Structure formats: structure tokens, C-alpha cells
Design an enzyme around this catalytic site. Structure first.
Site, PDB file in Angstrom:
ATOM      1  N   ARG A  55     -19.927  -9.621  -3.340  1.00 29.17           N
ATOM      2  CA  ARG A  55     -20.108  -9.284  -4.765  1.00 29.17           C
ATOM      3  C   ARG A  55     -20.923 -10.699  -5.183  1.00 29.17           C
ATOM      4  O   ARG A  55     -20.396 -11.865  -4.658  1.00 29.17           O
ATOM      5  CB  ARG A  55     -19.156  -9.081  -5.566  1.00 29.17           C
ATOM      6  CG  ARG A  55     -18.491  -7.473  -5.236  1.00 29.17           C
ATOM      7  CD  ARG A  55     -16.908  -7.310  -5.740  1.00 29.17           C
ATOM      8  NE  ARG A  55     -17.013  -6.219  -6.680  1.00 29.17           N
ATOM      9  CZ  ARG A  55     -15.859  -6.093  -7.491  1.00 29.17           C
ATOM     10  NH1 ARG A  55     -15.020  -6.976  -7.650  1.00 29.17           N
ATOM     11  NH2 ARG A  55     -15.980  -5.092  -8.513  1.00 29.17           N
ATOM     12  N   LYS A  76      -6.304 -10.080   3.067  1.00 23.56           N
ATOM     13  CA  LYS A  76      -7.698  -9.482   2.857  1.00 23.56           C
ATOM     14  C   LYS A  76      -8.103  -8.916   4.343  1.00 23.56           C
ATOM     15  O   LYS A  76      -8.174  -9.401   5.345  1.00 23.56           O
ATOM     16  CB  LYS A  76      -8.916 -10.230   2.550  1.00 23.56           C
ATOM     17  CG  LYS A  76      -9.552  -9.736   1.475  1.00 23.56           C
ATOM     18  CD  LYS A  76     -10.965 -10.178   1.063  1.00 23.56           C
ATOM     19  CE  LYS A  76     -11.939  -9.184   0.310  1.00 23.56           C
ATOM     20  NZ  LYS A  76     -12.666  -9.948  -0.688  1.00 23.56           N
ATOM     21  N   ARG A 125      -3.889 -11.556  -9.265  1.00 22.54           N
ATOM     22  CA  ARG A 125      -2.864 -12.472  -8.488  1.00 22.54           C
ATOM     23  C   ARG A 125      -1.378 -12.215  -8.932  1.00 22.54           C
ATOM     24  O   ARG A 125      -0.960 -11.727 -10.234  1.00 22.54           O
ATOM     25  CB  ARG A 125      -2.879 -13.975  -8.508  1.00 22.54           C
ATOM     26  CG  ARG A 125      -4.417 -14.410  -8.597  1.00 22.54           C
ATOM     27  CD  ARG A 125      -4.905 -14.926  -6.995  1.00 22.54           C
ATOM     28  NE  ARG A 125      -4.935 -16.499  -7.017  1.00 22.54           N
ATOM     29  CZ  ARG A 125      -6.147 -17.018  -7.520  1.00 22.54           C
ATOM     30  NH1 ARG A 125      -7.024 -16.507  -7.726  1.00 22.54           N
ATOM     31  NH2 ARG A 125      -5.955 -18.250  -7.281  1.00 22.54           N
TER      32      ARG A 125
HETATM   33  N1  LIG Z   1     -14.481 -10.988   6.946  1.00 18.65           N
HETATM   34  C1  LIG Z   1     -13.713 -11.351   5.835  1.00 18.65           C
HETATM   35  N2  LIG Z   1     -12.711 -10.685   5.508  1.00 18.65           N
HETATM   36  C2  LIG Z   1     -11.952 -11.293   4.270  1.00 18.65           C
HETATM   37  N3  LIG Z   1     -12.635 -11.866   3.455  1.00 18.65           N
HETATM   38  C3  LIG Z   1     -13.686 -12.472   3.678  1.00 18.65           C
HETATM   39  C4  LIG Z   1     -14.479 -12.154   4.866  1.00 18.65           C
HETATM   40  N4  LIG Z   1     -15.593 -12.820   4.773  1.00 18.65           N
HETATM   41  C5  LIG Z   1     -15.596 -13.407   3.590  1.00 18.65           C
HETATM   42  N5  LIG Z   1     -14.563 -13.303   3.022  1.00 18.65           N
HETATM   43  C6  LIG Z   1     -14.306 -13.646   1.589  1.00 18.65           C
HETATM   44  O1  LIG Z   1     -14.604 -12.355   1.005  1.00 18.65           O
HETATM   45  C7  LIG Z   1     -15.357 -13.051  -0.277  1.00 18.65           C
HETATM   46  C8  LIG Z   1     -16.400 -11.548  -0.752  1.00 18.65           C
HETATM   47  O2  LIG Z   1     -15.412 -10.747  -1.191  1.00 18.65           O
HETATM   48  P1  LIG Z   1     -16.075 -10.113  -2.259  1.00 18.65           P
HETATM   49  O3  LIG Z   1     -14.924  -8.859  -3.031  1.00 18.65           O
HETATM   50  O4  LIG Z   1     -16.955 -10.619  -3.286  1.00 18.65           O
HETATM   51  O5  LIG Z   1     -17.088  -8.920  -1.389  1.00 18.65           O
HETATM   52  C9  LIG Z   1     -16.785  -7.965  -0.874  1.00 18.65           C
HETATM   53  O6  LIG Z   1     -15.482  -8.133  -0.249  1.00 18.65           O
HETATM   54  C10 LIG Z   1     -17.542  -6.674  -0.064  1.00 18.65           C
HETATM   55  C11 LIG Z   1     -18.227  -6.929   1.200  1.00 18.65           C
HETATM   56  C12 LIG Z   1     -18.269  -5.873   1.950  1.00 18.65           C
HETATM   57  C13 LIG Z   1     -18.704  -6.164   3.453  1.00 18.65           C
HETATM   58  C14 LIG Z   1     -19.543  -4.807   3.801  1.00 18.65           C
HETATM   59  S1  LIG Z   1     -20.105  -5.213   5.274  1.00 18.65           S
HETATM   60  C15 LIG Z   1     -21.147  -4.133   5.587  1.00 18.65           C
HETATM   61  C16 LIG Z   1     -21.859  -3.571   3.832  1.00 18.65           C
HETATM   62  N6  LIG Z   1     -22.887  -4.364   3.971  1.00 18.65           N
HETATM   63  C17 LIG Z   1     -22.651  -5.502   3.229  1.00 18.65           C
HETATM   64  O7  LIG Z   1     -23.548  -6.374   3.435  1.00 18.65           O
HETATM   65  N7  LIG Z   1     -21.526  -5.550   2.774  1.00 18.65           N
HETATM   66  C18 LIG Z   1     -20.739  -4.301   2.977  1.00 18.65           C
HETATM   67  C19 LIG Z   1     -16.111 -13.897   0.158  1.00 18.65           C
HETATM   68  O8  LIG Z   1     -17.143 -14.899  -0.594  1.00 18.65           O
HETATM   69  C20 LIG Z   1     -14.929 -14.697   0.771  1.00 18.65           C
HETATM   70  O9  LIG Z   1     -15.309 -15.938   1.451  1.00 18.65           O
END
Ligand SMILES: Nc1ncnc2c1ncn2[C@@H]1O[C@H](COP(=O)(O)OC(=O)CCCC[C@@H]2SC[C@@H]3NC(=O)N[C@@H]32)[C@@H](O)[C@@H]1O
Length: 294
Positions: free
Chosen positions: A106, A164, A292
Site C-alpha cells: 500500500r 505477518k 497494535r
Molecule cells: N513478504 C513480506 N511479508 C510480510 N511483510 C512484508 C513482506 N514484504 C514486505 N513486508 C512489509 O509489508 C509492508 C507492506 O505492507 P502493506 O499492508 O502496506 O501492503 C501489503 O501487505 C499488500 C501487499 C500484497 C502482496 C501481493 S503480491 C502479488 C499482488 N501483487 C502485488 O504487487 N501485491 C499483491 C511493507 O512495507 C513491509 O516492508
């Protein structure tokens, strides 16, 4: 930083004997290693290392018929593909990948994944433009937690061990249909390698991306159809509660205007968070606001 043509020739994860697809072979390979892709060499044979067995596109198709699948090892973002290909799609057609060169969170944020260690897929969806999508993110999150037998967190997080386990990213397509046209992006950590993170391999070491993906999508689609009929009705709120990792907990609510605290009281009919703050129940809309445990 990255030779996309390399990687793409390497994306089959197969032993290639030094064909050139460049100008600085050792440089771009170490640059691919710096990005984090693993490239093992055994003498003269080079190989890109999948974190998990590559998926099989034909099996996904037959497992998900009649929905059409686009599979692509390397992609910018499975969401972008759905957006750029919207005209050729029907409700529920999917794009699946192994690795995203520009995985989207996001609000400008990034999504990280090693090659072939996630379930990464996006799909097209559509509602009657009169119907409200209040609560949609909850529906997606719950459908997954029901499949994986884990926990949800308002408004859209998937949780194991309070860590997460993946992400959900609903984007709106500026497409002229007489319909509200979504692309729904989902990443689920299966076997990885900031904050601590969870992966499905922790829970079921014999997980197979090949059969979990259709299980997720079949239930997701079902939960969505129920939502088009019933919304955030009282059955939903009960199903939510049972999977809600923060049910009736003391929480901190982080908004742009500061922190408010209290006891969580589930969700209302629009999917808003319900929180007993002081002597009233205050409600919050999922955009940006975070949660949180005190
Ligand atoms: N693999 C992971 N697992 C858990 N947290 C992560 C992560 N990679 C990054 N993060 C952290 O999660 C934050 C983002 O959390 P948000 O709620 O803002 O954003 C999300 O959680 C939604 C992202 C969803 C990914 C899938 S992948 C295929 C479809 N195609 C895409 O490009 N996206 C969707 C990042 O800024 C943090 O670094």
C-alpha cells in the site's frame, strides 16, 4: 542493477551452460545476487535457485477451470498484469508469478519475495456499481485464514504467531464497464529467504504451492460470492470473531491524529473497527489506520 533478459532466460531454474543473454556476465550475476536472487554454479553450469518447486501452469488451469490463468515466472507485479490486460478478462481470471521485480504494498510501499517462495497472485473482480465494497478487505483476509487455519487482523492482515504471514492489496481499475472493476493482489509467505514474518512452512512442512493455490482461490471466490449477497452480515461478524487475533483485546489504534486506546469490539456492518474508547464505542475506517496490542 538488473539484467531482466538474464533471469528471464534463467527463470526456468534449469541448468544452462553459459549462453550469453551479456556484456558483463560476472557483473550482472553478482548484481542479481545483490538483489538477492540465488545463482549457483557447478564448474560451467549456472542455475537460478527456486526457493520452492516451480508451479505448473497447466495444472493450475485444470484445477481452476473455467477461470483463465496467466503464469509468468518473472513479472513486474501480478497486479500490473491484471490492470494492463483487463479487456481480455472475465470475472475471476488470475495472474500468478514466482518473483516480482516491483511488488507493491500500500501507498508506495514494496512487497518482498524470494524467487518461488510465495503464493503471489492477482485477479480481476467486479461488482454492481451500486453495491458498496465496504468490508471487502475483511472478506479476502478471512477467506485465507479459513483455508490456512490461521488468524486475521483488521483490516487486512494474515497472522500466524502474531507475525505477518502475507499481504492483501485491493486496487481499483479505471476501466469503463458500467461496473466497479477490481484487481485483488495476494501474497502468502511460504518459505522465505524488517518486522518478524511468518511462513506456511512453519505450520505444514509438506505444504505444496501447487495445491494450496487452488484451495485458496476456490474459497476466496466463494466467500466473495457470499459477500455480494450478504455483506458484513452477522454470520460474517461471527466468523471474523473466531479468527480475529485481536478479539476483545486491549489495543492501541494509530491514526494520523495520534493514538487512541481501548478494548476491541469487533466490526460493524461496514467493516469498520469497533473500539470501546473511554465510555463510547468509536469506529475507524481501514485506510492507513493501524492496530497494535497494548
Ligand atoms: N513478504 C513480506 N511479508 C510480510 N511483510 C512484508 C513482506 N514484504 C514486505 N513486508 C512489509 O509489508 C509492508 C507492506 O505492507 P502493506 O499492508 O502496506 O501492503 C501489503 O501487505 C499488500 C501487499 C500484497 C502482496 C501481493 S503480491 C502479488 C499482488 N501483487 C502485488 O504487487 N501485491 C499483491 C511493507 O512495507 C513491509 O516492508
Amino acid at each position: 542493477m538488473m539484467n531482466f533478459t538474464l533471469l528471464t532466460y534463467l527463470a526456468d531454474c534449469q541448468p544452462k551452460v553459459r549462453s550469453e543473454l551479456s556484456k558483463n556476465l560476472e557483473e550482472d550475476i553478482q548484481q542479481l545476487r545483490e538483489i538477492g536472487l540465488d545463482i549457483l554454479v557447478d564448474g560451467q553450469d549456472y542455475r537460478l535457485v527456486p526457493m520452492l518447486p516451480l508451479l505448473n501452469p497447466q495444472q493450475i488451469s485444470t484445477a481452476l477451470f473455467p477461470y483463465s490463468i496467466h503464469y509468468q515466472p518473472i513479472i513486474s507485479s501480478t497486479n500490473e498484469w491484471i490492470l494492463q490486460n483487463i479487456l481480455s478478462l472475465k470475472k475471476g481470471d488470475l495472474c500468478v508469478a514466482e518473483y516480482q521485480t516491483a511488488g507493491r504494498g500500500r501507498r508506495g510501499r514494496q512487497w518482498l519475495s524470494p524467487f518461488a517462495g510465495q503464493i503471489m497472485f492477482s485477479f480481476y473482480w467486479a461488482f454492481d456499481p451500486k453495491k458498496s465494497i465496504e468490508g471487502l478487505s475483511l472478506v479476502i483476509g478471512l477467506a485465507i485464514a479459513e483455508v490456512l487455519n490461521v488468524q486475521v487482523k483488521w483490516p487486512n492482515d494474515i497472522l500466524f504467531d502474531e507475525r505477518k504471514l502475507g499481504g492483501i492489496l485491493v486496487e481499483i481499475a479505471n476501466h469503463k464497464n458500467g461496473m466497479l472493476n477490481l484487481v485483488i493482489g495476494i501474497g502468502i509467505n511460504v518459505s522465505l529467504s524488517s518486522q518478524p514474518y511468518a511462513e506456511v512452512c512453519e505450520i505444514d512442512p509438506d505444504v505444496e504451492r501447487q495445491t494450496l493455490l487452488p484451495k485458496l482461490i476456490q474459497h476466496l471466490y466463494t466467500r466473495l460470492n457470499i459477500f455480494e449477497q450478504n455483506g458484513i452480515d452477522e454470520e460474517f461478524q461471527q466468523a471474523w470473531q473466531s479468527y480475529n487475533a485481536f478479539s476483545n483485546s486491549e489495543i492501541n489504534v494509530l491514526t494520523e491524529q495520534g493514538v487512541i486506546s481501548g478494548i476491541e469490539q469487533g466490526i460493524d456492518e461496514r467493516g469498520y473497527l469497533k473500539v470501546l474508547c473511554g465510555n463510547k464505542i468509536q469506529m475507524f475506517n481501514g485506510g492507513e489506520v493501524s492496530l497494535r496490542k497494548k
